[PDB]
Paper text:
BCR–Abl is a constitutively activated form of the nonreceptor tyrosine kinase c-Abl. The improper activation of the Abl tyrosine kinase results in chronic myeloid leukemia (CML). The recognition of an inactive conformation of Abl, in which a catalytically important Asp-Phe-Gly (DFG) motif is flipped by approximately 180° with respect to the active conformation, underlies the specificity of the cancer drug imatinib, which is used to treat CML. Our results suggest that interconversion between distinctly different inactive conformations is a characteristic feature of the Abl kinase domain.
Molecules E and G were obtained from the same crystal form of Abl and are very similar, except for the presence of either the ATP-peptide analog (molecule E) or the kinase inhibitor PD166326 (molecule G). In these structures, the kinase adopts a conformation intermediate between αC-Glu In and αC-Glu Out: while helix αC is not rotated out of the active site of the kinase, a rotation of the side chain of Glu 286 has occurred, resulting in the breakage of the Glu 286–Lys 271 salt bridge. The conformation of Abl represented by molecules E and G suggests a mechanism by which Abl can interconvert between αC-Glu In and αC-Glu Out conformations.
Numbering used by the authors: 252 to 523
The structure:
Amino acid sequence: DKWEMERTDITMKHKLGGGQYGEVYEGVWKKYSLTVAVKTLKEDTMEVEEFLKEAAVMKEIKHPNLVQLLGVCTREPPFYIITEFMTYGNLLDYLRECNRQEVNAVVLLYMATQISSAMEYLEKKNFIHRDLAARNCLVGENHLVKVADFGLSRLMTGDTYTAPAGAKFPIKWTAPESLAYNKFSIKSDVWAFGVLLWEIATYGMSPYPGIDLSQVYELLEKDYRMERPEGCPEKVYELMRACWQWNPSDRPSFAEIHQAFETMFQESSISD
Ligand SMILES: Cn1c(=O)c(-c2c(Cl)cccc2Cl)cc2cnc(Nc3cccc(CO)c3)nc21
């Protein structure tokens, strides 16, 4: 296993995420004097075999906008998943604390384009992300954004899977078919992407402000959708609305979404 490395090849420096991502640390890959991120399996939380499968999936991921795997420690506990380290943390906190004069309109477009590229890649590689949201996107220097990939599941593109009963998902980012029947497909990620676009346009505001979680589904079925955020370009809002079509088959593919954003980003750049 060319990915396998000895636990002693890495040294832990600081704990990360405040615990919101589980047991994650900022470490050092000694040989290369390289700062890395290290995820360890939190006993009594996720099942070991599922943890190891995520590691297996990451070995197959190679895209500029998906967190890159660097190595794994799977022989014996503690199990480790080592990846590149993103300097600025998650996109949600980044947007909430940034200088909006720097992180302006073209930058928001740039970030959406990068995320859509990552999702287009997953769509082509038979993967879905179980929780696409700003909280799971990481930021690096120069507004580089990479989608975290620990939450990836193997699912043939176009197919649907049914989650266990009692499964708890982020209601405000969850597609209708998931809320009602626990059904998920790549189109469910498209719906989530629309909510993510809203998070970006509002610089990290919470979705459906003030709306009780228990009534989100009842509102969605009657065609209620979040309003266009102040400052949000019409074309981008139109894409959000397309992502939120009730019928999953009516939602655009990430290939189409990425093309749309790439075009807007180019035209916007040509207006330098
Ligand atoms: C929190 N987190 C992860 O869970 C993974 C990761 C791992 Cl270790 C294994 C598998 C999949 C992933 Cl996405 C990679 C990763 C890379 N960079 C960062 N940077 C980061 C996070 C929080 C705060 C700050 C700033 O102090 C900087 N945080 C990261």
